[PDB]
Design an enzyme around this catalytic site. Structure first.
Site, PDB file in Angstrom:
ATOM      1  N   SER A 166      55.130   5.906  52.703  1.00  0.00           N
ATOM      2  CA  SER A 166      55.429   4.796  51.804  1.00  0.00           C
ATOM      3  C   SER A 166      56.230   5.378  50.625  1.00  0.00           C
ATOM      4  CB  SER A 166      54.126   4.205  51.309  1.00  0.00           C
ATOM      5  OG  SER A 166      54.349   3.112  50.419  1.00  0.00           O
TER       6      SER A 166
ATOM      7  N   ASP B 231      46.208  -4.634  53.886  1.00  0.00           N
ATOM      8  CA  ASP B 231      46.779  -3.437  53.244  1.00  0.00           C
ATOM      9  C   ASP B 231      46.008  -3.053  52.009  1.00  0.00           C
ATOM     10  OD1 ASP B 231      49.377  -1.685  53.203  1.00  0.00           O
ATOM     11  OD2 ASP B 231      49.111  -2.339  51.087  1.00  0.00           O
TER      12      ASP B 231
ATOM     13  N   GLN C 156      48.935 -20.952  52.224  1.00  0.00           N
ATOM     14  CA  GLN C 156      50.342 -21.317  52.290  1.00  0.00           C
ATOM     15  C   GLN C 156      51.196 -20.207  52.988  1.00  0.00           C
ATOM     16  OE1 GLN C 156      52.386 -22.790  48.664  1.00  0.00           O
ATOM     17  NE2 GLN C 156      53.931 -21.265  49.257  1.00  0.00           N
ATOM     18  N   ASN C 157      50.867 -18.941  52.694  1.00  0.00           N
ATOM     19  CA  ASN C 157      51.737 -17.832  53.143  1.00  0.00           C
ATOM     20  C   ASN C 157      51.784 -17.654  54.644  1.00  0.00           C
ATOM     21  OD1 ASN C 157      52.567 -17.410  50.568  1.00  0.00           O
ATOM     22  ND2 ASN C 157      51.109 -15.665  50.125  1.00  0.00           N
TER      23      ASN C 157
ATOM     24  N   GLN D 154      56.592   2.061  54.144  1.00  0.00           N
ATOM     25  CA  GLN D 154      56.274   0.879  53.340  1.00  0.00           C
ATOM     26  C   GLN D 154      56.945   1.019  51.989  1.00  0.00           C
ATOM     27  OE1 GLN D 154      52.599  -0.787  50.849  1.00  0.00           O
ATOM     28  NE2 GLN D 154      52.107  -0.687  53.022  1.00  0.00           N
TER      29      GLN D 154
ATOM     30  N   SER E 128      55.872  -5.917  47.452  1.00  0.00           N
ATOM     31  CA  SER E 128      56.474  -6.711  46.391  1.00  0.00           C
ATOM     32  C   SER E 128      57.559  -7.654  46.929  1.00  0.00           C
ATOM     33  CB  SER E 128      57.008  -5.817  45.271  1.00  0.00           C
ATOM     34  OG  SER E 128      55.935  -5.095  44.690  1.00  0.00           O
TER      35      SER E 128
ATOM     36  N   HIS F 211      51.028   7.641  50.320  1.00  0.00           N
ATOM     37  CA  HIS F 211      51.281   6.486  49.460  1.00  0.00           C
ATOM     38  C   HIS F 211      52.615   6.612  48.735  1.00  0.00           C
ATOM     39  CE1 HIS F 211      48.802   3.369  46.932  1.00  0.00           C
ATOM     40  NE2 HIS F 211      50.095   2.969  46.984  1.00  0.00           N
TER      41      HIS F 211
ATOM     42  N   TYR G  26      43.723   1.544  44.970  1.00  0.00           N
ATOM     43  CA  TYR G  26      43.421   0.142  44.644  1.00  0.00           C
ATOM     44  C   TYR G  26      42.023  -0.066  44.141  1.00  0.00           C
ATOM     45  CZ  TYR G  26      47.792  -0.601  47.232  1.00  0.00           C
ATOM     46  OH  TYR G  26      49.033  -0.536  47.793  1.00  0.00           O
TER      47      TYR G  26
ATOM     48  N   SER H 152      56.656  -8.811  43.063  1.00  0.00           N
ATOM     49  CA  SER H 152      55.631  -7.993  42.373  1.00  0.00           C
ATOM     50  C   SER H 152      54.757  -8.806  41.463  1.00  0.00           C
ATOM     51  CB  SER H 152      56.210  -6.772  41.612  1.00  0.00           C
ATOM     52  OG  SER H 152      56.550  -7.147  40.274  1.00  0.00           O
TER      53      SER H 152
ATOM     54  N   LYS I 110      45.774   4.460  52.275  1.00  0.00           N
ATOM     55  CA  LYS I 110      46.878   5.394  51.871  1.00  0.00           C
ATOM     56  C   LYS I 110      46.307   6.557  51.042  1.00  0.00           C
ATOM     57  CE  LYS I 110      49.831   1.277  51.038  1.00  0.00           C
ATOM     58  NZ  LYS I 110      48.848   0.317  50.485  1.00  0.00           N
TER      59      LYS I 110
ATOM     60  N   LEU J  69      57.364 -10.723  47.209  1.00  0.00           N
ATOM     61  CA  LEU J  69      57.414 -11.931  46.390  1.00  0.00           C
ATOM     62  C   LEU J  69      57.851 -11.631  44.970  1.00  0.00           C
ATOM     63  CD1 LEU J  69      54.236 -13.751  47.703  1.00  0.00           C
ATOM     64  CD2 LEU J  69      56.581 -13.940  48.494  1.00  0.00           C
TER      65      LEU J  69
END
Ligand SMILES: NC(=O)c1ccc[n+]([C@@H]2O[C@H](COP(=O)([O-])OP(=O)(O)OC[C@H]3O[C@@H](n4cnc5c(N)ncnc54)[C@H](OP(=O)(O)O)[C@@H]3O)[C@@H](O)[C@H]2O)c1
Ligand SMILES: O=[N+]([O-])c1ccc(S(=O)(=O)c2ccccc2)cc1O
Length: 315
Positions: free
Chosen positions: A161, A45, A274-275, A185, A212, A112, A50, A216, A79, A214
């Site tokens: 989004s 994403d 880990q994710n 989104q 977000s 976006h 960004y 943010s 986006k 987790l």
């Protein structure tokens, strides 16, 4: 693991979040996107906002060139930024994104945000008081320009989004609508679980994609430092102990079990790997009810900058 979208394409249900704030060197996006693909992320994403599409697109192309993945195995999102909602700016913005990423198509192109901004050079055109200078654009006209991008093959799928239910409705009710959005989104985590918007989306075969998830990155531009820290929540931490996983994995798994596609940003090699463990365990019905109990209507993005925009989605 993928979900089938309403236009027949497929979206992997775990996606890698690529945003990092401007203090993070641009080269890092290249390194951590390659890490994410090595770990098993297949949905990536990004966005014009960004300032990382070149690095993210290079990471994808590197992993195609070294034989690790094929292009058809990767689901790449960018986006349309909010200064490009006027319809004649939409296909140009998309073509710019494709050229930065050096890709022939994006799997997904989103509007976006609904909060249209004055067209011009600046990412964030600001007034006197640091409020974004708004523009008035019928977003149904922006949507029609998005549909033409799908018809041209520049985006395989199109979505939105940061839309609320009423803004989505406006698009679904458009005369002559050709393609529904495939997704919306939105900010979504156990402090802001969006269950009403989720139920609407499911009723319309629109995927809710959680950002977000987790809690943010708590950027000081947008996020009150007093806001409780999601991953410190005691119920998430108790569930992490019960399952011998981590509070982040509990928050990600929660979303999959509700039918939500979930993003996760990490620029740390261990946490990226880990994710992906989100697919390795399950939460019980009681664990999910415990998590539902945490809802407190908290959207971490909560700044005057935009809370006064005429299309601000929160109320
Ligand atoms: N459409 C929009 O308006 C919008 C808005 C916001 C975000 N997004 C998208 O959604 C993505 C994700 O949202 P987000 O950037 O707000 O961040 P997030 O996914 O909520 O993650 C927040 C923080 O969690 C930390 N983290 C990740 N995995 C962890 C783990 N296993 N254990 C503990 N901490 C962990 C990361 O820090 P480390 O990097 O230090 O690991 C990260 O900064 C974005 O990158 C972007 O792609 C879209
Ligand atoms: O972390 N990001 O990925 C990211 C950060 C900021 C914004 S924003 O448009 O400022 C905004 C502002 C207010 C509410 C939602 C979105 C978009 C993003 O996608």
């Amino acid at each position: 693991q993928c979900v089938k979208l309403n236009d027949g394409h497929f979206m992997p249900v775990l996606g890698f979040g690529t945003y990092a704030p401007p203090e993070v060197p641009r080269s890092k996006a290249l390194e951590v996107t390659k890490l994410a693909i090595e770990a098993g992320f297949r949905h990536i994403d990004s966005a014009h906002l960004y300032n990382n599409e070149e690095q993210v697109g290079l990471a994808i192309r590197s992993k195609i060139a070294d034989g690790s993945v094929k292009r058809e195995d990767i689901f790449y999102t960018s986006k349309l930024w909010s200064t490009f909602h006027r319809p004649e700016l939409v296909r140009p913005a998309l073509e710019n994104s494709l050229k930065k990423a050096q890709l022939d198509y994006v799997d997904l192109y989103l509007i976006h945000s609904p909060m249209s901004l004055k067209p011009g050079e600046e990412l964030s055109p600001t007034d006197e008081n640091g409020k974004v200078i708004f523009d008035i654009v019928d977003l149904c006209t922006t949507w029609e320009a998005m549909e033409k991008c799908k018809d041209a093959g520049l985006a395989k799928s199109i979505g939105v989004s940061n839309f609320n239910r009423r803004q989505l409705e406006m698009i679904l009710n458009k005369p002559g609508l050709k393609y529904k959005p495939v997704c919306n989104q939105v900010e979504c985590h156990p402090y802001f679980n969006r269950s009403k918007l989720l139920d609407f989306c499911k009723s319309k075969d629109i995927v809710l994609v959680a950002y977000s998830a987790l809690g943010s990155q708590r950027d000081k531009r947008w996020v009150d430092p007093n806001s409780p820290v999601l991953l410190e929540d005691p119920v998430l931490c108790a569930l992490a102990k019960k399952h011998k996983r981590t509070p982040a994995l509990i928050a990600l798994r929660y979303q999959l079990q509700r039918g939500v596609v979930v993003l996760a940003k990490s620029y740390n090699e261990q946490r990226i790997r880990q994710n992906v463990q989100v697919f390795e365990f399950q939460l019980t019905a009681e664990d999910m009810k415990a998590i539902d109990g945490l809802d407190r209507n908290l959207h971490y993005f909560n700044s005057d900058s935009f809370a006064s925009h005429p299309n601000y989605p929160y109320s």
